[PDB]
């Protein structure tokens, strides 16, 4: 049983993963993934920071999916305060929530192929990604790591003109997804390296807490977005892409299908986004508008206290989970009455998925392990936190 | 509402299958797609000559602004220090002889800074702003640490564009 | 004061379905042209 460290710096291994492996022949006898090569303290650091200054940590937890993560903390802090965002903000979060799902799937499908050896899909879709980033930048200011979705709504209304461009792009992106399919969906070779690799049973997927496409790929029907609606994902209409004969190829097809379904959700959001405000009107939770803080005393006091001290969330604890592109992203945020949190365990769709690597890659070749790490969309930020 | 992504022997059917298997058709299909793009205009930009577009809210590099008269805007309320997530900004102040309130030392550690843009948000006089420039890569680590004089100098150099950028986005804020 | 909103009447429609075209020479026809080439070559 030859032992070998897949290696932190592996061109294939996403980020840095030391996958100590015992390989009988080329077959992988045992898979003991090592983690923490990217532990950084995100959970302890948050205890020493106020709610609004811990929002930027969430973007960094799994930064492929920059915003969708922010929505989970937002929702969580809103629940604890029993405040809910204004109607326009909700649609925004679903608009950028979905755009972000595409961004993650373009990452997951194209990076999967680069490890497999197909390199042209990545360049094709990274150009589309690029175009999306620009939406982020023109809405938040940052290409990624925006900090746009804050605990009481979004930070600033969309620029005057973004919606139109999030249309032109959406109107075309489909063809770009179509092109990739041609090369891979039916490549006489993609199928082989992906089909019947890492099959996970339905009962086993629920047991190991997979909770993501990984469950959906095995045929279990669960989309937290339809089962437990958050924001206004209830008012839209989309089809969960369930899969059968769950294997690397089937789940892939599912991720390409949610890229397709997210364009259906984005279209609607553009078609039906309401006129209104983008942040709660409670100066108590949301910072006052700058014209107001510069002309009204109560607004300055509320601006000064909010930025310097904080929300002062009422004491309680909540576990709120959304459907981040990877899977169920949840924040268990225990909170004392103080302005800074007490605990914030981030449930990472990924801590559970990696664990499954062992029960998925059994009697498999070195190349199979590379394919399976891809079909779990492992971003070491969320796993290591 | 759910959907089945991959739910699913006549001679013709079998023969066509064999045609694909032995003539590698689905492989030739893939080659056609790449040949097609070879003919598309590539999307790259000459980086020094042409620059990727950044709109007014781009956070980029920190600068401290001054009033048109010439009085630096910062009045050392020090809540930019309070809301800095990374502990980057260090401010110590004392009453200037004028009697006014000014910062003796304002040090943004850019390596500590994660460019969140909250400081831009928090300032009441809006003295500290996220300036447009993103190209400030430096040979030595010390250069990245910035004192009041570098930021004020950064502010003077980019004030014209900073003013235009704040002009465009203030209604939104 | 203006707020970026969907244009009046809503935006146009987008494609959310694969438009991959099932275009190919039929298999028999494909084999016949090939076998004919070998027959001519052999002769």
């Amino acid at each position: 049983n030859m032992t070998l460290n897949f290696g932190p710096q592996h061109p294939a291994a996403h980020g840095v993963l030391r996958l100590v492996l015992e390989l009988s022949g080329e077959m992988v006898r045992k898979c003991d993934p090592h983690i923490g090569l990217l532990h950084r303290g995100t959970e302890k650091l948050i205890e020493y920071k106020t709610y609004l200054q811990a929002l930027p940590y969430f973007d960094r937890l799994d930064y492929v999916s920059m915003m969708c993560n922010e929505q989970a903390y937002s929702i969580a802090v809103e629940k604890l305060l029993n405040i809910q965002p204004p109607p326009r903000a909700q649609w925004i979060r679903v608009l950028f929530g979905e755009i972000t799902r595409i961004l993650n799937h373009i990452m997951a499908v194209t990076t999967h192929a680069l490890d497999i050896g197909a390199m042209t899909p990545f360049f094709w879709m990274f150009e589309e990604r690029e175009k999306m980033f620009e939406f982020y930048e023109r809405v938040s200011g940052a290409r990624m790591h925006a900090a746009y979705i804050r605990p009481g709504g979004v930070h600033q209304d969309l620029p005057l003109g973004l919606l139109d461009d999030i249309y032109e792009f959406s109107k075309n992106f489909s063809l770009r997804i179509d092109e990739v399919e041609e090369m891979l969906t039916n490549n006489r070779i993609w199928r082989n390296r992906t089909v019947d690799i890492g099959v996970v049973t339905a009962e086993d997927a629920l047991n190991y807490g997979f909770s993501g496409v990984m469950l959906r790929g095995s045929g279990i029907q669960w989309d937290l977005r339809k089962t437990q609606p958050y924001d206004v994902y209830d008012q839209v209409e989309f089809d969960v892409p369930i899969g059968s004969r769950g294997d690397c190829y089937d789940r892939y097809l599912c991720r390409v299908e949610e890229m397709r379904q997210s364009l259906r959700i984005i279209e609607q959001c553009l078609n039906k986004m309401p006129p209104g405000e983008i942040k709660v009107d409670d100066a108590k939770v949301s910072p006052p508008k700058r014209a107001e803080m510069k002309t009204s005393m109560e607004s300055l006091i509320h601006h000064f206290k909010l930025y310097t001290e904080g929300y002062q969330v009422p004491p309680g604890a909540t576990y709120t989970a959304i459907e981040a592109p990877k899977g169920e992203f949840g924040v268990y945020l225990v909170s004392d009455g103080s302005s800074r949190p007490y605990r914030c365990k981030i449930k990472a769709p990924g801590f559970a998925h990696l664990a499954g690597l062992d029960k998925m890659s059994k009697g498999h070749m070195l190349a199979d392990v590379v394919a399976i790490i891809g079909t779990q969309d492992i971003v070491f930020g969320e796993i290591d936190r | 509402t759910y959907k089945y992504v991959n739910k699913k022997v006549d001679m013709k059917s079998a023969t066509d299958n064999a045609a694909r298997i032995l003539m590698w058709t689905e492989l030739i299909r893939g080659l056609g797609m790449t040949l097609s793009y070879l003919f598309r205009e590539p999307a790259t930009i000459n980086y020094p000559f042409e620059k990727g577009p950044l709109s007014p809210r781009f956070r980029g590099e920190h600068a401290l602004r001054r009033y048109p008269s010439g009085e630096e805007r910062c009045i050392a309320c020090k809540l930019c220090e309070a809301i800095c997530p990374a502990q980057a900004i260090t401010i110590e102040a004392e009453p200037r002889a004028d009697g006014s309130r000014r910062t003796t030392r304002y040090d943004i550690d850019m390596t500590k800074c994660i460019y969140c843009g909250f400081c831009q948000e928090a300032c009441p006089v809006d003295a500290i702003v996220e300036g447009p420039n993103f190209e400030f890569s430096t040979e030595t680590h010390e250069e990245l640490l910035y004192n009041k004089e570098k930021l004020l100098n950064n502010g003077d150099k980019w004030e014209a564009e900073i003013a235009a950028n704040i002009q465009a986005d203030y209604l939104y804020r | 004061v203006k707020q970026d909103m969907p244009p009046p009447g809503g935006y146009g429609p987008i494609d959310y379905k694969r438009n991959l075209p099932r275009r190919g020479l039929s298999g028999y026809s494909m084999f016949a042209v090939g076998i004919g080439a070998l027959i001519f070559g052999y002769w």
Binding site: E127, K131, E168, F169, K171, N172, S174, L175, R176, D178, E179, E182 | R29, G32, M33, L35, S36, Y37, F39, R40, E41, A43 | N19, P21, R23
Partner: peptide, 28 residues
């Protein structure tokens, strides 16, 4: 763009669909 009407047709024939309608070059 700037297909010239012949590189475009090789592009359309090879792809099997009209890229002209959904181009990679965003324009005004």
């Amino acid at each position: 763009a700037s297909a010239t009407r012949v590189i475009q047709k090789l592009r359309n024939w090879a792809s099997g669909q009209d890229l002209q309608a959904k181009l990679q070059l965003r324009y005004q």
